[PDB]
């Protein structure tokens, strides 16, 4: 029903956005490791 769709859409956007930002934080870690390897190879 209507309120069921309200609750479901709220949970949808909550869990999908939380997965999105979790993956971008792991992307941040990948960027950090990549420049660490870059500077280690240059030195």
């Amino acid at each position: 029903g209507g309120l069921g769709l309200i609750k479901s859409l709220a949970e949808k956007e909550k869990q999908l956005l939380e997965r999105l930002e979790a993956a971008k934080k792991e992307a941040e870690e990948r960027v950090k490791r990549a420049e660490a390897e870059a500077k280690a190879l240059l030195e």
């Binding site: 999908l16 997965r19 971008k24 992307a27 870059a38």
Partner: protein, 62 residues
């Protein structure tokens, strides 16, 4: 539900695609800097080889 599954699938596939695009572009940026470093060491050691040649020739003449 099924609609949760398909929307989670599409958003997860597009953050996956964002990961792939960003990291491929960043690696293509970094590779040129690393090859610049290696070829700069090549040209640097070539110029220092010319310097060693000048030192040996002037030691010879002296």
């Amino acid at each position: 539900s099924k609609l949760e599954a398909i929307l989670s699938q599409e958003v997860e596939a597009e953050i996956q695609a964002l990961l792939q695009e960003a990291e491929a572009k960043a690696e293509a940026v970094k590779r040129e800097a690393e090859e610049k470093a290696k070829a700069l060491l090549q040209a640097r050691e070539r110029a220092l080889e010319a310097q060693y040649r000048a030192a040996l020739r002037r030691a010879e003449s002296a």
